[PDB]
């Protein structure tokens, strides 16, 4: 009786998806917030 091993796709996704989401949030906020004119 064998058992399925832990999916490497899920293992690397655990570190990928939050990392991509954080990078996207950083780029989005940085490029959009400091956009208005100043005196």
């Amino acid at each position, epitope marked *: 009786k064998t058992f399925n091993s832990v999916s490497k796709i899920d293992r690397l996704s655990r570190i990928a998806f939050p990392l991509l989401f954080g990078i996207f949030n950083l780029v989005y906020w940085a490029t959009y917030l400091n956009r*208005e*004119p*100043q*005196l």
Partner: nanobody, 108 residues
Framework: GSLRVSCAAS????????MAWFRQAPGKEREFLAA???????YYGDSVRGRFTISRDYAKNSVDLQLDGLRPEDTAVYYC?????????????????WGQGTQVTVSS
């Protein structure tokens, strides 16, 4: 002498934006000449009030400036800009779009 300089936009409709003209002489900062608003409303700088005339053709999306009564120290490169006037309508910093500039020289 008299002259007419046209400025045609492309890639973006500026019918709702404010279209203005600026001047840059050698060794001076950018000076506001004239501006036209969405409501066909005209603003002019004091140094060039009563001489220059600004017009906007919304159909072909362009702003024209008619220069009359030129005097020799008006030689400069003229820039065309379009944008919404925030903190501005007279300051260059309020415009995001600018032309490459056209040189104008007056000979005595």
């Amino acid at each position: 002498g008299s002259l007419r300089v046209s400025c045609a936009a492309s890639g973006r409709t500026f019918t709702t934006y404010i279209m203005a003209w600026f001047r840059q002489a050698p060794g001076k900062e950018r000076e506001f000449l004239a501006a036209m608003d969405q409501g066909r409303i005209q603003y002019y700088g004091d140094s060039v009030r009563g001489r220059f005339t600004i017009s906007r053709d919304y159909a072909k999306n362009s702003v024209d400036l008619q220069l009359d009564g030129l005097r020799p120290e008006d030689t400069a490169v003229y820039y065309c800009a379009a944008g919404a006037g925030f903190w501005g309508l007279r300051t260059a910093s309020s415009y995001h779009y600018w032309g490459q500039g056209t040189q104008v020289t007056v000979s005595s």
